[PDB]
């Protein structure tokens, strides 16, 4: 989507494997604010907004 009309996808009731994203070489920025990437694959959240 365009930045004025940015797409928001609500992610619920599944298993979120963040190590697949973190260990990818295809991403230039993976800057996490408020949490570290190593404990993302352990912690649990109510909803994920993408």
């Amino acid at each position: 989507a365009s930045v004025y009309a940015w797409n928001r996808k609500r992610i619920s009731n599944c298993v979120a494997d963040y190590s697949v994203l973190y260990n990818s070489a295809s991403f230039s920025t993976f800057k996490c604010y408020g949490v570290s990437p190593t404990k993302l694959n352990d912690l649990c959240f109510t909803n994920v907004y993408a």
């Binding site: 609500r10 619920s12 009731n13 909803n47």
Partner: protein, 39 residues
């Protein structure tokens, strides 16, 4: 043939969606208990 759904008019802000396997002279007896404890 089921061709009439008139239960709502709108759906604005969804927090949770869950699609599952179907639960289901009178021949069947269905007992259900619904509880709201700690969310």
């Amino acid at each position: 043939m089921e061709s009439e759904f008139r239960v709502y008019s709108s759906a604005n802000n969804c927090t949770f969606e869950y699609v599952s396997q179907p639960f289901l002279n009178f021949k069947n007896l269905r007992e259900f208990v619904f509880k709201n404890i700690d969310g």
